[PDB]
Design a protein around this nucleic acid. Sequence first.
RNA 1: UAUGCCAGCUGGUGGAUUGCUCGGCUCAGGCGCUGAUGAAGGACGUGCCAAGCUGCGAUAAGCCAUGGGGAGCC
RNA 2: GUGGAAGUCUGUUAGAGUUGGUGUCCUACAAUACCCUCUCGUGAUCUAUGUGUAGGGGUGAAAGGCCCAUCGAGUCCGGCA
RNA 3: GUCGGGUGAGAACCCCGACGGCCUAAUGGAUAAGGGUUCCUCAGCACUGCUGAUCAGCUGAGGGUUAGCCGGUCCUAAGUC
RNA 4: AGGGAAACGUGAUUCAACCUGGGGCCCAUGAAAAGACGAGCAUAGUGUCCGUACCGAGAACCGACACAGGUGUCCAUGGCGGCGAAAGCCAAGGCCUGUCGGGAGCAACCAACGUUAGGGAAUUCGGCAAGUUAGUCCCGUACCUUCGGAAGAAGGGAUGCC
RNA 5: UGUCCCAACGUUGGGCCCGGUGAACUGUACAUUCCAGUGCGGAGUCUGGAGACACCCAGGGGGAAGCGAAGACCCUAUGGA
Lengths: 82, 143, 56, 81, 46
Amino acid sequence: ERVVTIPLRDARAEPNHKRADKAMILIREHLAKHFSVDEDAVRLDPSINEAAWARGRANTPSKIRVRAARFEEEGEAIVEAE
Amino acid sequence: TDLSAQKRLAADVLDVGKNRVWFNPERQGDIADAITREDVRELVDEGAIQAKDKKGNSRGRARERQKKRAYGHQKGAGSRKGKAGARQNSKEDWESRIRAQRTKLRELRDEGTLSSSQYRDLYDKAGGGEFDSVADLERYIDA
Amino acid sequence: TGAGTPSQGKKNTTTHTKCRRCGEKSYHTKKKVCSSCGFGKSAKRRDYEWQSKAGE
Amino acid sequence: SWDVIKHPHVTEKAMNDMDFQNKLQFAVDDRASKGEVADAVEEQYDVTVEQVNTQNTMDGEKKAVVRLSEDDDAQEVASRI
Amino acid sequence: GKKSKATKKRLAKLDNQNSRVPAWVMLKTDRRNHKRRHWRRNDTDE
RNA sequence: UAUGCCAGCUGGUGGAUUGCUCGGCUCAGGCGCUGAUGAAGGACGUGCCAAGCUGCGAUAAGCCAUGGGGAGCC
RNA sequence: GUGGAAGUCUGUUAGAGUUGGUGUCCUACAAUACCCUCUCGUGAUCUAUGUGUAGGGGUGAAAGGCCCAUCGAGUCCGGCA
RNA sequence: GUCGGGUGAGAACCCCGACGGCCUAAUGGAUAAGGGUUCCUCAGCACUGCUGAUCAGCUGAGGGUUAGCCGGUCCUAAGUC
RNA sequence: AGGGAAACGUGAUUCAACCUGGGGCCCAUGAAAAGACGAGCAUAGUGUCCGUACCGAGAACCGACACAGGUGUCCAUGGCGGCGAAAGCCAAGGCCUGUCGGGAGCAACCAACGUUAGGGAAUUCGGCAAGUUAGUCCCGUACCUUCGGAAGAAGGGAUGCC
RNA sequence: UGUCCCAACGUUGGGCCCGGUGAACUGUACAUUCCAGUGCGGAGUCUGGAGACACCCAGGGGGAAGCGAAGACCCUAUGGA
Ligand SMILES: [Cl-]
Ligand SMILES: [Cl-]
Ligand SMILES: [Mg+2]
Ligand SMILES: [Mg+2]
Ligand SMILES: [Mg+2]
Ligand SMILES: [Mg+2]
Ligand SMILES: [Mg+2]
Ligand SMILES: [Mg+2]
Ligand SMILES: [Mg+2]
Ligand SMILES: [Mg+2]
Ligand SMILES: [Mg+2]
Ligand SMILES: [Mg+2]
Ligand SMILES: [Mg+2]
Ligand SMILES: [Mg+2]
Ligand SMILES: [Mg+2]
Ligand code: NA
Ligand code: NA
Ligand code: NA
Ligand code: NA
Ligand code: NA
Ligand code: NA
Ligand code: NA
Ligand code: NA
Ligand code: NA
Ligand code: NA
Ligand code: NA
Ligand SMILES: [Sr+2]
Ligand SMILES: [Sr+2]
Ligand SMILES: [Sr+2]
Ligand SMILES: [Sr+2]
Ligand SMILES: [Sr+2]
Ligand SMILES: [Sr+2]
Ligand SMILES: [Sr+2]
Ligand SMILES: [Sr+2]
Ligand SMILES: [Sr+2]
Ligand SMILES: [Sr+2]
Ligand SMILES: [Sr+2]
Ligand SMILES: [Sr+2]
Ligand SMILES: [Sr+2]
Ligand SMILES: [Sr+2]
Ligand SMILES: [Sr+2]
Ligand SMILES: [Sr+2]
Ligand SMILES: [Sr+2]
Ligand SMILES: [Sr+2]
Ligand SMILES: [Sr+2]
Ligand SMILES: [Sr+2]
Ligand SMILES: [Sr+2]
Ligand SMILES: [Sr+2]
Ligand SMILES: [Sr+2]
Ligand SMILES: [Sr+2]
Ligand SMILES: [Sr+2]
Ligand SMILES: [Sr+2]
Ligand SMILES: [Sr+2]
Ligand SMILES: [Sr+2]
Ligand SMILES: [Sr+2]
């Protein structure tokens, strides 16, 4: 478990009306990589979803501080806002 | 589990739009067993099924604006969209004025202040649009 | 407005219906005449030699 | 000579009408009137008919909802057949 | 629309004919309802 | 030696071919009117379970009589 | 001043229509469609349902227009191989 | 649309909640014509569904439309027999 | 009585529905019939027959289709807005089915579209396309004219908030 | 005033890659062609040369006198209306 800061600037590569969606993907990929786990094993607590969609589907925050834990037999991660 | 049928019965039992009924996430199993309307009323009392409140548009901002305008503000040239005759109906305004003048002349007559003949002369002039307002009529009467 | 597809949408009138006499859906409920058996037009049954080849 | 009553109409809805409203339901000849259904029912089960509602069904038949007087008991009547 | 009593009888019949060939007929004949109709895909008379 | 060409082998796809015939086609002989005593035709019903065909008509794949027939039948 | 006329004006009110883009589409969403622009919108107005007029005949403020994707003579079957 | 969860052999699109959205003469409510059981329930996914499907207007089976006072029914219109 | 967890209001303005009057128009005159009233009251009995589900549409209708087409009625008084049944935003209500998704800063090219210095129609058959102007108030308004009009001619100024 | 000088950058949906679904047009044969010539005078196929290792992706459409429609023009028929 540790607190990480995810930059979401790469969401700008996707059309503007869908930034929120791409953000949620970048977040999953970031954690999967930095916690050495499969993207399928990363669980995003709704708190994170609401943070990214706060200003609608087209206006994502530039970064997001997230608190994630890593454990269990298969190796998984659980993440949430802070 | 599929609770769409229960959503429909709930909307009817709670007498609300389906979009406002709320089903407790932790009781899909029990709601799923709810077959009858009575099964639904039962779950309603348990609080497992509830109705979200409906919203009403706030009129606070409207009220402040209403006050300013009633006080005569926020109606400068840059705030008007309709033609003058649309903002105030001229025939309607004349009806207001002419009735006000006739009521005035009528009170003065019963009051003895005006003789039926002076009343007539003034009445016919009012009908001919001689006086811009009541005050204008009174000012004239005072010679 | 085209005479084709757009003009097909206006068609919701009932004309030909099941005939009491012959059973075909040819009884014109407006004319009260069957275009198939002649019911409403004639006591005799509607028939014509041109309904088949001349020598048959 | 066609008969009036064809057979009892037995379904969940019929049973409720029987337990809660003292009503019996029958499949009847579609040429039968409410009155003819009342008489027939009284003469067949020796009961008193208070009201008869009818309906021509999408099965090509006529369904009748016969309410018996408080003097009679639908549940018991239908139970002897 | 407004269906008369007879129209209604005819519709009812059409609905009835729309049932399937009973299972036992299969065994008996040791092995289709050709008059299978659909309310949407087909069009009845009248 | 990939992509691939020609012919064949095993398996498929397809339903030709051969064989078969409960259906047709044509000829010949016989026979030949029905209906208000409601025909022909159609509709809707009718079966333990019955959708289609056939039969039948609320006595509804059937009722009665006489003769035939026969230990099976629905 | 009153009054409120008008095959009167503005108007994507409803509703009716369709000037241009020679735009989009053109094995289409569609055998006549889509978008913007545009015209009419108290009247010779628009519109629903019922009803009448039938093929050398209708109907036509006339374009040979329209009479069920069909018209300088409908459609079907027959004449007919 | 997204994040969680539910069911299931199987879930991007079946259901629950949250967050985010769309429709305001309509993408809401009641109905005429027309359709004809498409309605409701249960069980299903071979067929139908612009992908998938545990879902459905699909498949199988059951069930459902209750009137003195709502229509029809009565009257007559253009007009028809 | 009913209904509501509860309270279970009182006044006002503007007033669709509905009621009732006044005026004007016609080389146009705006149905008929059944029925009802006229013509009291009590009690009782009778009131049969047919329709009744559901869709009513960017999937239940017509268009071969779960078709961007076509298809009548009423909801024309929900809030802000404004002249408004206009735009835009928001309720009640409905929906995420104008039903395939995943990925590349996602190249060329195409459909829609935004912003372009200086020049300003040189482009083109042609200003086609795009743009310019714009609501409201005040001032002011030519030729011509059938005296109605032309006319919002033109041109000029103003416009928020407190 | 990006119509133009004279084009640039950007936005959304496609285009491109991946999963799933999954048609049609067209097809005498052969076919890697190019330059000339020849030929019923408008040749990928004949002749002479030249060039040419096979396969695949994307592209804009030069050619196949490309595909689509037994030329609507013109003439001819002891044709039609
Ligand atoms: Cl009705
Ligand atoms: Cl008055
Ligand atoms: Mg289910
Ligand atoms: Mg005036
Ligand atoms: Mg009834
Ligand atoms: Mg059924
Ligand atoms: Mg008409
Ligand atoms: Mg001409
Ligand atoms: Mg669709
Ligand atoms: Mg520039
Ligand atoms: Mg030039
Ligand atoms: Mg222009
Ligand atoms: Mg030719
Ligand atoms: Mg010619
Ligand atoms: Mg000639
Ligand atoms: Na029965
Ligand atoms: Na149909
Ligand atoms: Na004979
Ligand atoms: Na059968
Ligand atoms: Na005057
Ligand atoms: Na146009
Ligand atoms: Na003719
Ligand atoms: Na308002
Ligand atoms: Na889907
Ligand atoms: Na430009
Ligand atoms: Na080419
Ligand atoms: Sr026209
Ligand atoms: Sr159209
Ligand atoms: Sr119509
Ligand atoms: Sr006749
Ligand atoms: Sr004859
Ligand atoms: Sr049934
Ligand atoms: Sr259809
Ligand atoms: Sr006008
Ligand atoms: Sr106008
Ligand atoms: Sr043009
Ligand atoms: Sr344009
Ligand atoms: Sr076209
Ligand atoms: Sr007006
Ligand atoms: Sr035509
Ligand atoms: Sr012929
Ligand atoms: Sr399967
Ligand atoms: Sr359903
Ligand atoms: Sr008033
Ligand atoms: Sr209903
Ligand atoms: Sr509707
Ligand atoms: Sr529509
Ligand atoms: Sr809402
Ligand atoms: Sr789908
Ligand atoms: Sr800028
Ligand atoms: Sr020029
Ligand atoms: Sr020039
Ligand atoms: Sr100005
Ligand atoms: Sr050679
Ligand atoms: Sr290309």
